[PDB]
Ligand binder design. Sequence first.
Ligand SMILES: Cc1nc2c(S(C)(=O)=O)cc(CCc3nc(N4CCCC4)nn3C)nn2c1C
Ligand SMILES: [Mg+2]
Ligand SMILES: [Zn+2]
Length: 312
Amino acid sequence: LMQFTLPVRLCKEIELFHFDIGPFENMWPGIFVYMVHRSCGTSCFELEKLCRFIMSVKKNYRRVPYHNWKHAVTVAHCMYAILQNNHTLFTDLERKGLLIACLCHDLDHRGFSNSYLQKFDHPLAALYSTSTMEQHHFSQTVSILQLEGHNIFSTLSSSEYEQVLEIIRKAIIATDLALYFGNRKQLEEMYQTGSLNLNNQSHRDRVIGLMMTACDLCSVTKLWPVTKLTANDIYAEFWAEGDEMKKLGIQPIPMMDRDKKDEVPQGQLGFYNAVAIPCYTTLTQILPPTEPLLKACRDNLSQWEKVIRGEE
Ligand SMILES: Cc1nc2c(S(C)(=O)=O)cc(CCc3nc(N4CCCC4)nn3C)nn2c1C
Ligand SMILES: [Mg+2]
Ligand SMILES: [Zn+2]
């Protein structure tokens, strides 16, 4: 049967946490199938249903600067690297669910925060009062799973299907960063008082939530030139949202005000110190073989410090 294979440099570097999937959009589906096949098996999904699923998922990501199809596949590769470094820790259903959740986690993102949708009074803000975009992404995921010929989970029992859709729902909701701060504190406490227990389902759920935040933020774990150019896309969105806040008669927060372009380096410091480093530190305590993500994060913080010192 039909293995996907990658050129040599990608075959070796895809295994590393800091891999960048590259600028050739047409290779991203093959990269994803490659990662399914190694992390899950050639048996996990029917190739034709999987291919069809991946292509409808792509079609439902919008042409926005950051929250686009490249982000989806990027977050899926970080999950691949976590799963492959922690072979025996995860169930077969988790292996199945988590790469799908990662590919799907920002489906139909419009380039605006939950907060902007609430202030604009978008219909989605009435349908979903918290984690607005994330409930939308999970909804789009179910929609695409229900298209004819798209049920990649059709070989699972009813109860196994319900479990996988529940891993996916929780993994996608956990990407709402408003939820991360508390998830991470609870995990920091359970790990330190030694109550953390991977047989407890509500504990796995938290650990998979943190994994989701870690994959989602994985821009900060790349080689410096990747990190730095990705920040440009991240701000291109924030600043467009800022413009849209000013159109509603609202001062955006500094993060979203393009008049604060000059403070970016200091904004990245606060973000590495308040969000990124805590994220990868707690993740490395729970899952020691994820340490290269923390190391890469720390290398990038120290590059932002250099930019501030005028050394860059
Ligand atoms: C992967 C990645 N995720 C993010 C996010 S997130 C997870 O919210 O999506 C936010 C940020 C912006 C952080 C920030 N910038 C500023 N300023 C800009 C100039 C004035 C103030 N303040 N703050 C807090 N960066 N980022 C990165 C590199
Ligand atoms: Mg999101
Ligand atoms: Zn995302």
